[PDB]
Design a protein around this ligand. Structure first.
Ligand SMILES: [Zn+2]
Ligand SMILES: [Zn+2]
Lengths: 121, 168, 145, 237, 391
């Protein structure tokens, strides 16, 4: 959940700097003397068990992909029954076999995962 | 026998339904692995046990039904040539093919052949040959059985070469 | 297993989890470094309670979040995890963590001048070279009867 | 490299390989496979940018993120924002001969890539094309009986030809890489929507998306294995 | 009357396959490839290094097949007599040469494939094949060299111009690599391998990415290569690589790379960094900078372009490859399947004989600038081609 900042003048990357005196987070540039205050205090995250990428591929034309299986599940939003579906597109040994469905009318994505902790995808 | 065939075909139908539930089950995330064994490895282990245990029952079925004058059976009973697996594959069902200890893998993307749709883990899709040799194989099964076969012919040359050097 | 207790499925689990090598890595959902400058209160709403428990220190904070299932699937306490961390690092790193009842498992660490490199290496030491339970070299252990 | 790969389906024979050391490294072309001779890409390249392809020098990803990358013989030439239009046209053009038939074109829908190859050495085979529609209800093979008769008139006069079949978009050559983006029916009857206890079990069309159909499954074999009677009743070695 | 629009059935396949084989026969792979050699690739081998330092070759004609005799001399050769006589069913080659100042013509014998357009048998009827003593069922596609029928066996190789990523096993200090073998249809067949390497294994400290360029004796930090190509700011460099601004995981993996290139902040410097890794101490700066340019313009991804304005194109493609390497290191994509037959190419007669008659027309064209570098002032060795072919 990092977002990444660049110098307004150089477009080089910004690095963190503590404002020792007032106890605040700055990003500075190493190439200009530009600086700006930080948006959050999170500067680094490492997900060991990640979901980024389960849904990669979902694209306006997903339903013209003849190779994808189809089902008659209904979706939560449109109550339509035109889906395509696939497994997780992370390419792990340690993935579930859960399915991801894509509603072909309203483009809503949903899962067959009955322990869904996911909001987003 | 006609009746034996129908039993064999039901024996097989029931294993494919076992498979379909263990499928639906992993698909809803309700299956558990147990202990260092991944989900997908647990899935596979189970589907292969089902599919083997089907082969075998279907083969026991055929063996039983053959009479004492059945000349295949006479050879087997004498000990002079052939065994159960041969009855079985000839008359009841040839069974799961495998390459490196696993079901036929997805060598196109997410599929074993272009005649299947993606993410298909079913028996057909990964190498179960439901037919016996008498009945004949379909084209897909034919190609997966040749995959398998091929692995024995290579394994066999490597064994022969490996063994010969050890022996010396 | 020892001659008495060799048909205890439960005394066999125990023996499994005393041998099966376990690192922080295997229980840790995600690690994070936050700028959280004032070591007596917190920019993190949720750990208000954990800080609220304390009858020198870096403003940069490393914070790990552990998995309840995995922690109990290897008969691990927070206490033991923290104790592990601590006697690894000793006076050189300051660590406190969420108690057992607590709903979420959190470890939060700080150093004790350029101070985020140390942290991301420190984090790597955490996650890989800290033996929690078990014996080196032993990757899975399975029961069979 | 010794093992029979899924991707050799229809291109190399699954049976014919010598014993020993050469096992699996010597192969035989399937009866109907062919190999590209190579063909120059410059009219395809021109065509693409007539059709909206935007050149790499203009590309700014942050500003067109939905874009499909377009590659030709292995070179990224740019980006296109409706690759469905472009793709329906490219194929129409290859089905009529304006693009040479042995050119291969793959769109990968979820990878947002469109790859085309006009180089020599690619091995391929022909398949029937399957198109919705009709008018008459389902998806159907583009060839129909009237085509077959023209064929058999020609055989019997010994002028409608194999090439007539390519030219009219009835048949098209597909390589292993393009094979990944289609769905093929094994027999023409898998298109229409009490069995013989002695027949083998076939697992039906759970498929409404076929794009192609095999001409005949026995064409996966090569020369030698095409002389065995009933190979489908034999253990594979 | 049977409807012309009716759907076909399984039997009707044999009609379509008969039609394929009446057209193609059984060895078209052979024929189609030789035919294309004779008709197009030959002439293109002459228009690469056409000119020397003046003298420039144009058109080729290909004889029908013929023999240099024992005495009574030069004669049409049919394949029955070459078999029998230990002959070599060959035709000859004639270029169109030009002298011009700055400070027909036989060149050889080409073994010709039976039933190619050039061989007598391809036009012949069934009677004609019996008069010539050639079985009407023979199908062609081989050569007769010294009276023996010789077939060339298709050679399988990888394709070039394809990016492939691979993990590397355990004791290695790199964990993944992405590799292309860049190549040419026009130019030569000159084969640079770019590799793009991710250093440090899963959670090492600063995993970095470096590329191996040809003649450069150290791996170069990918950001320096981006700077030598003209893409300077971290932000532009990252947007050729990570085409999705919310992929904070990819971007966080490209931070160490930004640190590893931080010292080099402009193109000139970047070239120089490179150029010094290619040149000895002593070489002056401008010459070093130019060494680097020429490496990048000529020997880095040359399938793209080998000419001057073409830097955004290479930049992007290097980017793409680093995206591919990362998508695999982040476990989004599997390592590439080195056995997918669609990434293979099989080399038949034409290509095999162009590997050869290129190589050899390049010797023959080198003996022409030696009638000429020692000429203090139509004198060509034919045979070198003839017998390299046959040999
Ligand atoms: Zn700046
Ligand atoms: Zn919907």
């Amino acid at each position: 959940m990092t977002t990444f900042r660049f110098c307004r003048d150089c477009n080089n990357m910004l690095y963190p700097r503590e404002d020792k005196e007032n106890n605040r987070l700055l990003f500075e540039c190493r190439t200009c003397s530009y600086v700006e205050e930080a948006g959050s205090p999170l500067v680094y995250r490492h997900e060991l068990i990640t979901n980024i990428g389960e849904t990669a591929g979902v694209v306006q034309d997903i339903g013209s992909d003849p190779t994808l299986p189809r089902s008659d599940r209904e979706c939560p939003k449109c109550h339509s029954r035109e889906n395509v579906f696939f497994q997780s597109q992370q390419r792990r040994k340690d993935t579930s076999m859960v399915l991801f469905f894509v509603c072909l009318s309203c483009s809503h994505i949903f899962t067959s995962d009955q322990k869904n902790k996911r909001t987003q995808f | 026998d006609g009746p034996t065939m129908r039993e064999i075909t039901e024996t097989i139908a029931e294993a494919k339904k076992k498979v379909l539930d263990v499928t639906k089950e992993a698909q809803a995330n309700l299956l558990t692995a147990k202990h260092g064994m991944t989900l997908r490895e647990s899935f596979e282990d189970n589907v292969v046990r089902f599919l083997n245990e089907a082969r075998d029952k279907a083969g026991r079925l055929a063996e039983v039904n053959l009479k004492d004058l059945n000349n295949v059976k006479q050879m087997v009973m004498a000990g002079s040539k052939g065994s159960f697996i041969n009855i079985a594959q000839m008359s009841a069902c040839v069974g799961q093919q495998s390459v490196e200890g696993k079901r036929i893998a997805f060598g196109f993307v997410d599929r074993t052949l272009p005649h299947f749709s993606k993410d298909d883990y079913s028996p057909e899709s990964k190498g179960f040959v439901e037919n016996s040799y008498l009945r004949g194989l379909t084209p897909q099964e034919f190609f997966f059985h040749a995959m398998g076969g091929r692995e024995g012919l290579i394994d066999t040359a490597v064994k022969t070469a490996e063994t010969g050097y050890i022996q010396r | 297993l020892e001659p008495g207790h060799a048909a205890d499925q439960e005394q066999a689990k125990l023996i499994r989890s005393a041998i099966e090598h376990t690192t922080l890595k295997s229980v840790t959902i995600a690690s994070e470094i936050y700028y959280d400058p004032d070591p007596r209160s917190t920019v993190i709403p949720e750990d208000e309670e954990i800080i609220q428990l304390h009858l020198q220190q870096s403003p940069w904070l490393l914070r790990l979040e552990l998995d309840r299932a995995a922690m109990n699937d290897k008969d691990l306490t927070m206490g033991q995890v923290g104790e592990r961390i601590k006697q690894t690092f000793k006076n050189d790193l300051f660590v406190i963590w969420s108690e057992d009842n607590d709903e979420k498992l959190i470890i939060r660490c700080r150093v004790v001048a350029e101070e985020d490199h140390m942290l991301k290496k420190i984090e790597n030491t955490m996650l890989e070279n800290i033996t929690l339970r078990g014996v080196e070299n032993i990757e899975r252990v399975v029961m069979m009867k | 490299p010794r093992q029979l790969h899924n991707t050799h389906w229809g291109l190399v024979c699954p049976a014919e390989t010598p014993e020993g050391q050469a096992c699996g490294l010597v192969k035989n072309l399937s009866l109907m496979s062919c190999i590209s001779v190579g063909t120059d890409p410059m009219p395809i390249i021109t065509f693409l940018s007539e059709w909206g392809m935007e050149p790499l020098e203009d590309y700014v990803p942050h500003q067109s993120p939905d874009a499909t990358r377009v590659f030709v013989n292995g070179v990224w030439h740019g980006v296109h924002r409706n690759p469905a239009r472009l793709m329906e046209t490219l194929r129409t053009l290859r089905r009529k001969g304006d693009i040479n038939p042995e050119v291969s074109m793959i769109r990968d829908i979820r990878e947002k890539e469109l790859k085309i190859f006009t180089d020599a050495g690619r091995v391929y085979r022909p398949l029937f094309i399957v198109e919705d529609d009709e008018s008459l209800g389902h998806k159907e093979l583009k060839v129909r009986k009237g085509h077959i008769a023209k064929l058999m008139a020609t055989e019997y006069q010994d002028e409608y030809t194999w090439s007539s079949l390519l030219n009219e978009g009835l048949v098209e050559y597909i390589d292993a890489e393009e094979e990944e983006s289609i769905l093929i029916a094994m027999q023409p009857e898998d298109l229409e929507p009490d069995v013989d206890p002695a027949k083998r079990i076939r697992v039906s069309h759970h498929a409404t998306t076929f794009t192609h159909c095999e001409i005949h499954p026995s064409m996966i074999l090569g020369v030698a294995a095409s002389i065995i009677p009933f190979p489908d009743h034999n253990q594979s070695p | 009357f049977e409807d012309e629009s009716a759907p076909i059935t399984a039997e009707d396949s044999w009609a379509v396959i008969s039609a394929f084989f009446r057209e193609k026969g059984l060895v078209s792979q052979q024929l189609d490839s030789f035919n294309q050699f004779v008709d197009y690739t030959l002439q293109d081998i002459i228009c690469e290094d056409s000119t020397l330092i003046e003298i420039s070759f144009g058109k080729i004609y290909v004889t029908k097949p013929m023999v240099n005799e024992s005495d009574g001399v030069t004669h049409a050769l049919y394949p029955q007599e070459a078999r029998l006589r230990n002959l070599t069913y060959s035709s000859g080659l004639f270029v169109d040469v030009k002298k011009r100042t700055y400070e027909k013509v036989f060149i050889g014998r080409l073994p010709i494939m039976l039933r190619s357009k050039n061989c007598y048998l391809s036009e012949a009827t069934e009677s004609d094949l019996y008069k010539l003593k050639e079985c009407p069922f023979d199908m062609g596609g081989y050569f007769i060299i010294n009276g023996s029928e010789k077939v060339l066996i298709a050679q399988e190789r990888s394709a070039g111009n394809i990016v492939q990523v691979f993990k590397k096993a355990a004791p290695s200090p790199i964990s993944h690599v992405a590799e292309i073998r860049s190549a040419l249809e026009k130019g030569s067949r000159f084969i640079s391998t770019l590799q793009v390497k991710l250093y440090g294994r899963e959670g090492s400290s600063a995993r970095t990415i470096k590329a191996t360029l040809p003649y450069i004796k150290q791996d170069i930090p990918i950001v320096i290569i981006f700077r030598a190509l003209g893409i300077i700011p971290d932000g532009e460099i990252l947007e050729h690589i990570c085409y999705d601004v919310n992929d904070w995981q990819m971007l966080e993996m490209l931070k160490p790379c930004v640190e590893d290139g931080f010292v080099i902040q402009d193109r000139e410097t970047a070239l120089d960094f490179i150029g010094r890794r290619g040149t000895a101490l002593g070489i002056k700066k401008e010459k070093r900078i130019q060494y680097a340019k020429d490496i990048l313009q000529k020997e880095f991804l040359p399938h793209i372009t080998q000419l001057e304005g073409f830097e955004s194109r290479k930049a992007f493609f290097l980017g793409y490859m680093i995206n591919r390497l990362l998508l695999c290191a982040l476990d989004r994509k599997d390592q590439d399947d080195r056995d997918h037959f669609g990434k293979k190419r099989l080399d038949l007669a034409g290509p095999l004989l162009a590997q050869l008659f290129k190589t050899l027309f390049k010797k023959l064209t080198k003996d022409i600038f030696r009638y000429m570098q020692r000429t203090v002032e139509l004198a060509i060795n034919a045979k070198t081609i003839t017998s390299g072919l046959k040999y």
